[PDB]
Amino acid sequence: RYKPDWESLREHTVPKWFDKAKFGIFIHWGIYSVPGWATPTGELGKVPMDAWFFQNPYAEWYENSLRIKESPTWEYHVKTYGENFEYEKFADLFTAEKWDPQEWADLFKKAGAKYVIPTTKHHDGFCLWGTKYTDFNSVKRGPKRDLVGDLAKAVREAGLRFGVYYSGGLDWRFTTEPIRYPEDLSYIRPNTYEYADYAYKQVMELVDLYLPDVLWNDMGWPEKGKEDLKYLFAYYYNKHPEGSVNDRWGVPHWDFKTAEYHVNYPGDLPGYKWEFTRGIGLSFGYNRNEGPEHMLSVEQLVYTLVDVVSKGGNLLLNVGPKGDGTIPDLQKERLLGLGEWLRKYGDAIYGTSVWERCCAKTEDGTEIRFTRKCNRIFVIFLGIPTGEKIVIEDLNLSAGTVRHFLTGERLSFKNVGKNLEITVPKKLLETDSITLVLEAVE
Amino acid sequence: RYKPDWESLREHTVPKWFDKAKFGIFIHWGIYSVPGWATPTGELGKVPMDAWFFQNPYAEWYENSLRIKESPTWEYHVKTYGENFEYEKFADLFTAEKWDPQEWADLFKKAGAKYVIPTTKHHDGFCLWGTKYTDFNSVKRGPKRDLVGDLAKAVREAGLRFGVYYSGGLDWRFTTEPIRYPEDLSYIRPNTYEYADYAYKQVMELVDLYLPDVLWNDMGWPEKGKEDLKYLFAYYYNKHPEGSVNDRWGVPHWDFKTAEYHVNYPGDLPGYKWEFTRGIGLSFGYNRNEGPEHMLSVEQLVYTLVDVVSKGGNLLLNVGPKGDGTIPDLQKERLLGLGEWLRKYGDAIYGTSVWERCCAKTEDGTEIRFTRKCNRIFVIFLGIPTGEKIVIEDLNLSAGTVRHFLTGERLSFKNVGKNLEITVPKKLLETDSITLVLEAVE
Amino acid sequence: RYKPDWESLREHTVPKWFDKAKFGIFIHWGIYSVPGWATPTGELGKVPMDAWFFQNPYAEWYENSLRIKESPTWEYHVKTYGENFEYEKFADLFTAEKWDPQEWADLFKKAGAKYVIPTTKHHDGFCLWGTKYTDFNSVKRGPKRDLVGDLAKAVREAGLRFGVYYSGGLDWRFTTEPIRYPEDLSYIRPNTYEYADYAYKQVMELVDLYLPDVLWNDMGWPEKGKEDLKYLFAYYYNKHPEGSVNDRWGVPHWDFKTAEYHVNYPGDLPGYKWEFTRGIGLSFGYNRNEGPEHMLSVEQLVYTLVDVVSKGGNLLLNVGPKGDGTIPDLQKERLLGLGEWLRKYGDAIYGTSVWERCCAKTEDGTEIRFTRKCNRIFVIFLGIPTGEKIVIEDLNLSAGTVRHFLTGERLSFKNVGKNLEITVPKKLLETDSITLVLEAVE
Amino acid sequence: RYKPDWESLREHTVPKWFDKAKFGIFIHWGIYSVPGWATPTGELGKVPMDAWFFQNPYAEWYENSLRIKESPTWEYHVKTYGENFEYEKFADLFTAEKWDPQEWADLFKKAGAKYVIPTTKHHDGFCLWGTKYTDFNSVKRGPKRDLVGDLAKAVREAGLRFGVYYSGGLDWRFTTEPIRYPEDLSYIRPNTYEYADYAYKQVMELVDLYLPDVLWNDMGWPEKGKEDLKYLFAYYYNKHPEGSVNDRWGVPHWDFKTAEYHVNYPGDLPGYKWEFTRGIGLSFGYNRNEGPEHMLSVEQLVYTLVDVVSKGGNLLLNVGPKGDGTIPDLQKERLLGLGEWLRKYGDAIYGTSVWERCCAKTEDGTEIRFTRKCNRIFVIFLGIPTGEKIVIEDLNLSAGTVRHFLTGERLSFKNVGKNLEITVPKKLLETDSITLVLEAVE
Numbered sequence A, B, C, D: 001r002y003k004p005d006w007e008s009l010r011e012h013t014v015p016k017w018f019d020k021a022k023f024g025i026f027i028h029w030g031i032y033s034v035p036g037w038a039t040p041t042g043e044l045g046k047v048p049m050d051a052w053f054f055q056n057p058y059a060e061w062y063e064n065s066l067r068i069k070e071s072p073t074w075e076y077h078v079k080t081y082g083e084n085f086e087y088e089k090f091a092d093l094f095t096a097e098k099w100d101p102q103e104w105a106d107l108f109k110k111a112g113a114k115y116v117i118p119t120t121k122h123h124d125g126f127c128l129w130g131t132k133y134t135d136f137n138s139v140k141r142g143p144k145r146d147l148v149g150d151l152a153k154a155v156r157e158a159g160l161r162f163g164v165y166y167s168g169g170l171d172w173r174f175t176t177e178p179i180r181y182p183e184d185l186s187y188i189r190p191n192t193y194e195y196a197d198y199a200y201k202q203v204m205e206l207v208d209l210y211l212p213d214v215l216w217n218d219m220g221w222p223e224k225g226k227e228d229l230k231y232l233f234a235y236y237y238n239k240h241p242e243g244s245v246n247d248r249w250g251v252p253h254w255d256f257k258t259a260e261y262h263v264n265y266p267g268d269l270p271g272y273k274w275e276f277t278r279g280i281g282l283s284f285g286y287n288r289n290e291g292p293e294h295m296l297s298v299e300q301l302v303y304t305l306v307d308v309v310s311k312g313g314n315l316l317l318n319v320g321p322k323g324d325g326t327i328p329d330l331q332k333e334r335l336l337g338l339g340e341w342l343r344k345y346g347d348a349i350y351g352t353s354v355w356e357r358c359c360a361k362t363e364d365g366t367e368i369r370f371t372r373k374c375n376r377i378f379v380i381f382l383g384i385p386t387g388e389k390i391v392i393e394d395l396n397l398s399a400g401t402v403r404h405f406l407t408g409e410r411l412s413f414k415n416v417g418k419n420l421e422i423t424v425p426k427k428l429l430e431t432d433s434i435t436l437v438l439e440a441v442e
């Protein structure tokens, strides 16, 4: 068994299934989904942090924004709901009237996801399972239902892995003051031993009820509770060796690291397993304010996934459901576009490993990414070059054979100096969908 | 007064009464006494630990065994009680209908015990006093009575000392997973700050309500609560300097050490005060599965006590009452047999001190133990030699006079080399009961 | 950069070169090599620890055995060197007059080894390099030569990786009392702040002077200096990302685990990179009392490496040189036999990965081990079956084509129930050297 | 074995020999003995601490008093030795030219002492043995002799136990500023890691070279080195189970407590082994300014020992020798008087135990003290009553027979109310030496 200590826990590494899966779906869903509103200011890492909490683009941060008087959210709220309308009242209006978990699971599978991870409890402290440690949960209020449980059953019946997200670092049911600046995060926290217990008992409870494939913590773990993780991790791994944990615990152990929008995003092979997460738009929770101008297009999604995968990561794309449980059309379409692309090109993504280098580019600026499967090297262009003559810069191959992936057609190539030159018959070029893919066999 | 710190607490040592008492009665009694069933596999220390929790001979471990599906206990339970019958339901069936505390106290006194210590709360977390910190106690469920309190009053009225046992290290009301291997004990524990408080408040509460003569902890103390013991010990000793604590706290202080069945059992004088504990059978809680083949015989009990005492220890013999509060006949008879022996030979046991050596043996293999009272040395044979000529190996005496204990009759002896030779007139030999005892006066 | 904390050091994992190397050479060489003597009692894990330090088979523990009077070593030393000859005096006799590092390095390469690791400082605290932190080193006394340095140049010239062994945990230059029982190890240690600084400074110096490929600590790291490792490991990896460290530091981080003779030997695949270490005989240091009866045969060596490799490990085989710098023939002879088999079957060892299972066996009991390389699955029999019909118990294949590894000859096979049946023509069976090796392409 | 942790060290208790010894000799001897001078202000506990360091009666604090300019010591030093004569220079005048250890040991035995403890290193940091950790020791300077060693051989030859005094807490070789107020002690200390190692290494060395019977630390142990004591005490007891340590280390463990002049003197029995220490005069070091007016008389010494003994303690009486190694007559004279009374009444002191109470007094106020030996109760009058009818206030006896201790003469007595009345014939009263001693057998 694993013993409750970091040295011993280090014996557990990211499970194969996770490394091989490449793509998963995040779901930020909660009472904040009811107001479903945020100012779509921009991407995390590009918006100045002296303004960010005041024009927060993360709609799941509604309550914190509402607590900042005279922030767009406050004005919005008072004009739509009134001032005698507390945030907590949304728990009663969160009825998931149209929710159908098998439909969600069907959709995420058509999209190409191999795992799914919903918010079991986000910063507002509202719980989506019938926890026995708080009455502010979905069985007692709103949906009158075990959202986490019913979704885990549907995902698993679809053949996908199921994880859980928990806001261990923050819980607004234990604070009153909102976060206005990044600095506040250092003192405006539950801070109590009672909260460290609560968080431990709630994650232990999710382990016992659903034995998730992934424990996805957010915002660090209560300082008073960090030592508890030795036991929790050992407890978790002894019941599920193929389980995994991310790196937002702030303790020595983790199975894979994370990056959010621009933050900690690698420019090259990082050297450890990681996972990229972002909303389809600029928010994780649903935002009725976002239009397609705020979202990635299917093409960008595809390019995002390939960049991630070529660097050894997994993409954890977030979908933001409505309070009624339906998935906005703008999101469903992109999930589908991506699913379409994975059906054609998935063999150069799932099950691959990184190669000597992640990246290259054609003489004209088209970006290229590589993935590998034993002796097979996939060459994925971010786009489809117009001309049959492709000049790839600073690359030489020793393969001897280079095929056009989709058709399997052997192609003509030769190293011309510091470059590699290939000729792709326009008939084939016109065959690819968003990316020209080639396969080199060494 | 004692100050709340180890250096200062070290000033308190095992009280005289404890050192001089030699023999006490443990009582493991609780809702587990209702099913009163275990597989009598063998003695702790001789059973392989990779099997022990799966065929646990400690019937008080019923709930943990029940949690291991398809363990003898699980099968037993389902066939006797059914699967829709939770362990906690036994709290209602635990009615102590026939319980009479003065009868118990009468009996333990006839048995020769000088102190008594019942389980106030065992691993299953059920409490035998009206604690104000949990409703899972005997005043609210089952007996509708303060078992601890009413027993303390009866024991004390009988002239005996009263202690309390508390399972500080384990409490199954805070965990779900059972202990299957010794290793699990390192992570499957309450683990919370709330539990460390609970345990502190409950022991403080027993101190305040009953001011026990002994605080007998089991399974170590919550890591988060260890520092609390400085205050609790100081608090306890300032109200009762003659109080005492065992060594199962896992902190610097203790007044006497312990050993259970074969574990930590000394082969010779240990050098500190200790106490030996074991069931009359192989379990502490009642086990309707044990027959006399599993129990010590009165003779073995006597030999056990003498070995213990010759080594500076006290024997804490456990009796396992039934759910109705009566003491199984097989147990009552051995308590009595021992009481009979202590009435005759008690002066070579109570109030004694160890001698230069604990042990010897006759040329034919009879084992011998010694105890002392000033200039008087008691020579206790584990059995009664058949022949009038007794040759004790590797021993010389300088006493000059050796009497036959029970009759007081001066006897003939002389050191023959490396041995001591004595002649015990068969009339006298036939006078002793389970042990031939001699007394040497130096 | 790697930062000085466990969570960031977690990012560094065992380098590819180490995982692919499979076989390395350990060298326990020092002033203890001069007396070169020990009682060849038995293998670690098989000798009772109540006797072990008194009849110690590790000749490099000579100083410790010498300090125990009335130990065979003590007897031997007094009759051979005299009661007045201090252990430290051996540094003057350690002359390494016949030492030729290139010759050593060439033998290690001819032997099939990919990396070499000498003891830079063993428990007696004598250092085989010109450390500036002690005068008890090979530059000031004995050889008047930097053995570590000269050997590192030599090993690298032969194209092999060079790691360093350092005794962080013990240093008999800081103690006077010998280790007699395992328990003694818990307190007979340097214990000072001074020692913690010494060890840090000395490993830092080894990193600075030689940038080893492997930092192999032994016996734990001084408690007071444990936090220093976050700084030392970050410093080391930042200078040498492809460097590696073992698991004998007693802190959270490590790149690969270790097993010594029977201790911690895996029965099956363990889930993490590890390395097995043992001498060719029963000692690490040269022991003149060992003859062939105490050493592994070439066949046993091959069987050992294959078993280790099939379970994901590397074999770190020890060579114990003489005080004169020569490698004893019994040792050389075995190193060469192993290298002869590696030249022939290398491709089924070097650069391989574990498969689904490590082991199988034939109807008549020949043990079988598996390794993998992409689609190629190597089948290694520990020995060569006499008949042509071979029945592999409990194994099915879905490769369609199985070849004889040495010749490439396609062979006839079929799944027969829960078994795999194969026909190997005796002429091929007669061509294999110690192991029948089959290759299955799936 | 004892393990290196407080709970295991708790197992070791004060050895029997120490408890039975009752009287030991302290020796504060060092380079401070040469100036041998101090203002004999008064007893510790009676002099105001606002003045104490400025008019210090402990002549061994000379260096500290010297550093306070305008202190009587400073005045005396400048007129006697000069402003240019550094304190350290006294090591060259400390020649011990008339030193005869056997002569010292014989005087201590003739004095009734059972153990001897010299200052191996006092606050000024000068060491009376050939330590390898400093050059400021008696082998390199001054006597050019290992005083500690030579005295240990001598004391043991006389059959007495030998302990060592070590100044763990202070060492003026690591500070420049003097102690002026009690408060200063909280920060004017060595304070370094270096010092913590020094102290550990030096006590380890004393244990190794001399295996003392008592490790008597003074002034606390450096905070940074406190954890080291678990290792040092385990190491010491494992080499010498019958060894002992005092209570001036500031860690959990100790074998006996101490009281200095009025500080911590018990008013009645305390419940733990302790030892009283003081000089014969007001200093520990030799003070040429003390005359008989500053010393205890033989009678006062006897009364002191009896009071200490009746309360369970040992008396550790200080002798302060001259720089030349001779013991001043005023001191010798008192040592011999005490030994004369011990030769006579020894049996009512040596090897005794406390009784039910320590004290009583006669109708006319003579103080009475009690000691015990099994059934024998010794009654010690601090002085000899003039009349034959003696009335002991508040005491009843149930012994039936009371004898005059010296003669054995049975005496007439009877319980008269809350008192005990006894008739002692003047001829016996005239035979006692400083104390009328009665023996009651119950």
Ligand SMILES: C[C@@H]1N[C@H](CNC(=O)c2cc3ccccc3[nH]2)[C@@H](O)[C@H](O)[C@@H]1O
Binding pocket: A028, A058, A060, A061, A218, A219, A220, A248, A258, A259, A260, A263, A264, A277, A284
């Ligand atoms: C997924 C996303 N996480 C946000 C909090 N982010 C972090 O705590 C953070 C830590 C961290 C570590 C590595 C890389 C990016 C990081 N963001 C939350 O505040 C959002 O509501 C949303 O749930």
Ligand SMILES: C[C@@H]1N[C@H](CNC(=O)c2cc3ccccc3[nH]2)[C@@H](O)[C@H](O)[C@@H]1O
Binding pocket: B028, B058, B060, B061, B218, B219, B220, B248, B258, B259, B260, B263, B264, B277, B284
């Ligand atoms: C009396 C007996 N104690 C068991 C737990 N035992 C220990 O925690 C243990 C600690 C220990 C320390 C020294 C010697 C033996 C020991 N057993 C309990 O698990 C049983 O139910 C029963 O109550």
Ligand SMILES: C[C@@H]1N[C@H](CNC(=O)c2cc3ccccc3[nH]2)[C@@H](O)[C@H](O)[C@@H]1O
Binding pocket: C028, C058, C060, C061, C218, C219, C220, C248, C259, C260, C263, C264, C277, C284
């Ligand atoms: C390679 C071999 N290592 C020995 C020390 N062994 C350990 O420190 C050790 C500790 C330990 C704990 C658990 C499992 C294996 C272990 N090896 C040394 O004492 C030998 O001289 C030799 O150098």
Ligand SMILES: C[C@@H]1N[C@H](CNC(=O)c2cc3ccccc3[nH]2)[C@@H](O)[C@H](O)[C@@H]1O
Binding pocket: D028, D058, D060, D061, D218, D219, D220, D248, D259, D260, D263, D264, D277, D284
């Ligand atoms: C025997 C005597 N001890 C003195 C130091 N005294 C203490 O460290 C001490 C501290 C303390 C605290 C509470 C009660 C008594 C104490 N003595 C030394 O400063 C004297 O030179 C002499 O050696």
